[PDB]
Design an enzyme around this catalytic site. Structure first.
Site, PDB file in Angstrom:
ATOM      1  N   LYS A 136       0.821  -1.211   0.000  1.00 18.45           N
ATOM      2  CA  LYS A 136       0.000   0.000   0.000  1.00 18.45           C
ATOM      3  C   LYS A 136       0.855   1.262   0.000  1.00 18.45           C
ATOM      4  O   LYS A 136       0.556   2.217  -0.712  1.00 18.45           O
ATOM      5  CB  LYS A 136      -0.927   0.022   1.221  1.00 18.45           C
TER       6      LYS A 136
ATOM      7  N   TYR B  42      16.236  -8.973   4.520  1.00 27.38           N
ATOM      8  CA  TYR B  42      15.832  -9.577   3.265  1.00 27.38           C
ATOM      9  C   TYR B  42      15.609 -11.063   3.525  1.00 27.38           C
ATOM     10  O   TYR B  42      16.431 -11.721   4.181  1.00 27.38           O
ATOM     11  CB  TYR B  42      16.902  -9.323   2.196  1.00 27.38           C
TER      12      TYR B  42
ATOM     13  N   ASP C 291      -1.173  -8.294  10.872  1.00 27.48           N
ATOM     14  CA  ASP C 291      -1.845  -8.783   9.671  1.00 27.48           C
ATOM     15  C   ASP C 291      -1.019  -9.905   9.039  1.00 27.48           C
ATOM     16  O   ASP C 291      -0.046  -9.651   8.326  1.00 27.48           O
ATOM     17  CB  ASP C 291      -2.060  -7.627   8.681  1.00 27.48           C
TER      18      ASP C 291
ATOM     19  N   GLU D 162       0.413 -13.327   2.195  1.00 28.40           N
ATOM     20  CA  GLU D 162       1.052 -12.292   1.389  1.00 28.40           C
ATOM     21  C   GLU D 162       2.019 -11.478   2.241  1.00 28.40           C
ATOM     22  O   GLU D 162       2.949 -10.869   1.720  1.00 28.40           O
ATOM     23  CB  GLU D 162       0.002 -11.360   0.757  1.00 28.40           C
TER      24      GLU D 162
ATOM     25  N   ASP E 187       4.427  -7.526   8.094  1.00 29.72           N
ATOM     26  CA  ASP E 187       3.344  -6.592   7.741  1.00 29.72           C
ATOM     27  C   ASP E 187       3.622  -5.155   8.207  1.00 29.72           C
ATOM     28  O   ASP E 187       4.625  -4.894   8.866  1.00 29.72           O
ATOM     29  CB  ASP E 187       2.023  -7.089   8.326  1.00 29.72           C
TER      30      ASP E 187
HETATM   31  C1  LIG Z   1      10.460  -4.894   9.120  1.00 35.76           C
HETATM   32  C2  LIG Z   1       9.212  -3.982   9.045  1.00 35.76           C
HETATM   33  C3  LIG Z   1       8.586  -4.007   7.665  1.00 35.76           C
HETATM   34  C4  LIG Z   1       7.904  -5.144   7.246  1.00 35.76           C
HETATM   35  C5  LIG Z   1       7.334  -5.180   5.983  1.00 35.76           C
HETATM   36  C6  LIG Z   1       7.468  -4.076   5.133  1.00 35.76           C
HETATM   37  N1  LIG Z   1       6.847  -4.126   3.855  1.00 35.76           N
HETATM   38  C7  LIG Z   1       7.199  -4.899   2.852  1.00 35.76           C
HETATM   39  S1  LIG Z   1       8.487  -5.997   2.787  1.00 35.76           S
HETATM   40  C8  LIG Z   1       8.278  -6.501   1.316  1.00 35.76           C
HETATM   41  C9  LIG Z   1       8.991  -7.393   0.638  1.00 35.76           C
HETATM   42  C10 LIG Z   1      10.260  -8.127   1.126  1.00 35.76           C
HETATM   43  C11 LIG Z   1      11.138  -7.712   2.163  1.00 35.76           C
HETATM   44  C12 LIG Z   1      12.230  -8.490   2.474  1.00 35.76           C
HETATM   45  N2  LIG Z   1      12.475  -9.605   1.816  1.00 35.76           N
HETATM   46  C13 LIG Z   1      11.702 -10.054   0.815  1.00 35.76           C
HETATM   47  N3  LIG Z   1      12.068 -11.289   0.185  1.00 35.76           N
HETATM   48  C14 LIG Z   1      11.670 -11.734  -1.178  1.00 35.76           C
HETATM   49  C15 LIG Z   1      10.504 -11.296  -1.806  1.00 35.76           C
HETATM   50  C16 LIG Z   1      10.138 -11.730  -3.082  1.00 35.76           C
HETATM   51  C17 LIG Z   1      10.981 -12.634  -3.712  1.00 35.76           C
HETATM   52  C18 LIG Z   1      10.602 -13.115  -5.111  1.00 35.76           C
HETATM   53  O1  LIG Z   1       9.387 -13.035  -5.501  1.00 35.76           O
HETATM   54  O2  LIG Z   1      11.504 -13.578  -5.891  1.00 35.76           O
HETATM   55  C19 LIG Z   1      12.148 -13.063  -3.046  1.00 35.76           C
HETATM   56  N4  LIG Z   1      12.443 -12.615  -1.839  1.00 35.76           N
HETATM   57  C20 LIG Z   1      10.583  -9.316   0.469  1.00 35.76           C
HETATM   58  C21 LIG Z   1       7.123  -5.879   0.622  1.00 35.76           C
HETATM   59  O3  LIG Z   1       6.776  -6.133  -0.530  1.00 35.76           O
HETATM   60  N5  LIG Z   1       6.363  -4.823   1.540  1.00 35.76           N
HETATM   61  C22 LIG Z   1       5.235  -4.033   1.248  1.00 35.76           C
HETATM   62  C23 LIG Z   1       8.141  -2.928   5.558  1.00 35.76           C
HETATM   63  C24 LIG Z   1       8.709  -2.901   6.831  1.00 35.76           C
END
Ligand SMILES: CCc1ccc(/N=C2\S/C(=C\c3ccnc(Nc4ccc(C(=O)O)cn4)c3)C(=O)N2C)cc1
Length: 249
Positions: free
Chosen positions: A17, A86, A130, A134, A148
Site C-alpha cells: 500500500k 531480506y 496482519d 502475502e 506486515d
Molecule cells: C520490518 C518492518 C517491515 C515489514 C514489511 C514491510 N513491507 C514490505 S516488505 C516486502 C517485501 C520483502 C522484504 C524483504 N524480503 C523479501 N524477500 C523476497 C521477496 C520476493 C521474492 C521473489 O518473488 O523472488 C524473493 N524474496 C521481500 C514488501 O513487498 N512490503 C510491502 C516494511 C517494513
C-alpha cells in the site's frame, strides 16, 4: 544516519500500500538487505504520516527470528527509506499458490513459528498483526517471517474487529485459526465474492472443512475460530496441542 548513496539498488521484491521494496546492497560491508521506498507526498495525501512512524520506532525494537527485522531508516528531500531484513525464499503466498495447499508438517511448523512470534509480540504488548500469507516471508532455511505494516480485506479479522467492539490479544488467535485453515485448504475459511457476505460469514462463524482435513486439525481450527474471544485458547495451549506437537518440528 544512512543515505541513499550508501546503497546499490537491485531487483524489485514487492509492492505494498505504502511503497515498493527492492533488493539492495550496502557498499562498505556488501550487506544484502531489502530497501523500501515511501514517497512522503503519497504518505501525506493519505494522512498516514506519523501514524506509521510510531510503528517504525516500535518495529525497530522487535528482535525475533520469526519477525522481519527493521534495521533502520532515513529520508531525502522527497522520499523516506526503510532498511529491512531480506528474506531469501519469498512469500508464503507465492509458495501456497504453487502447491495449492500445504501438508500438515509444513502447516503445523508455520503455526508453531507464528505462535512464538505472536507470543513474543504479546509480551512486548504488540497486538493484532496482519498475517495473511502475502505478509509472511520465508528466511534462508524456509523459516516463517512475519512481515506486515499495519497499526481492505476482512478475511483475517475476527468478529470483534469487524463488529466495532473492543479487542485484545485473542484477535491474533482467530488469525492463527484462519491461517491454519488456509494453509491446509488453500483458501481462508470465510472467503466470499463480496465484502458484505464475508462480513456475515465471519460474524456468524460459518466455515466448513473439506473431506481431507484430519480430525486433529479440525479440532485446533474449531477451537481457534470461536465468536466469543474468551473461549479461544492461549498461545501456550496452541503449542501444547496434540495435532501440532505430532506434526510440527
Ligand atoms: C520490518 C518492518 C517491515 C515489514 C514489511 C514491510 N513491507 C514490505 S516488505 C516486502 C517485501 C520483502 C522484504 C524483504 N524480503 C523479501 N524477500 C523476497 C521477496 C520476493 C521474492 C521473489 O518473488 O523472488 C524473493 N524474496 C521481500 C514488501 O513487498 N512490503 C510491502 C516494511 C517494513
Amino acid at each position: 544516519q544512512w543515505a541513499l548513496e550508501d546503497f546499490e539498488i537491485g531487483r524489485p521484491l514487492g509492492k505494498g500500500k505504502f511503497g515498493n521494496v527492492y533488493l539492495a546492497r550496502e557498499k562498505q560491508s556488501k550487506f544484502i538487505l531489502a530497501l523500501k521506498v515511501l514517497f512522503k507526498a503519497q504518505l501525506e495525501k493519505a494522512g498516514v504520516e506519523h501514524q506509521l512512524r510510531r510503528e517504525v520506532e516500535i518495529q525497530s525494537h522487535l528482535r525475533h527470528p520469526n519477525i522481519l527485522r527493521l534495521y533502520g531508516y532515513f529520508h531525502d528531500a522527497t522520499r523516506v527509506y526503510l532498511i529491512l531484513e531480506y528474506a531469501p525464499l519469498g512469500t508464503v503466498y507465492r509458495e501456497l499458490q504453487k502447491l495449492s495447499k500445504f501438508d500438515e508438517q509444513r502447516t503445523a511448523t508455520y503455526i508453531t513459528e507464528l505462535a512464538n512470534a505472536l507470543s513474543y509480540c504479546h509480551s512486548k504488548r504488540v497486538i493484532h498483526r496482519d498475517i495473511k500469507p502475502e505478509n509472511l516471508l520465508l528466511g534462508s532455511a524456509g523459516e516463517l517471517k512475519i512481515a506486515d505494516f499495519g497499526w481492505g480485506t476482512l478475511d483475517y479479522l475476527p468478529p470483534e474487529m469487524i463488529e466495532g467492539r473492543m479487542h485484545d490479544e485473542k484477535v491474533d488467535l482467530w488469525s492463527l485459526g484462519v491461517l491454519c485453515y488456509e494453509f491446509l485448504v488453500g483458501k481462508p475459511p470465510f472467503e466470499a465474492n463480496t465484502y458484505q457476505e464475508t462480513y456475515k460469514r465471519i460474524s456468524r462463524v460459518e466455515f466448513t472443512f473439506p473431506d481431507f482435513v484430519t480430525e486433529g486439525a479440525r479440532d485446533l481450527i474449531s477451537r481457534l475460530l470461536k465468536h466469543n474471544p474468551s473461549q479461544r485458547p492461549m498461545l501456550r495451549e496452541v503449542l501444547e496441542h496434540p495435532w501440532i506437537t505430532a506434526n510440527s518440528s
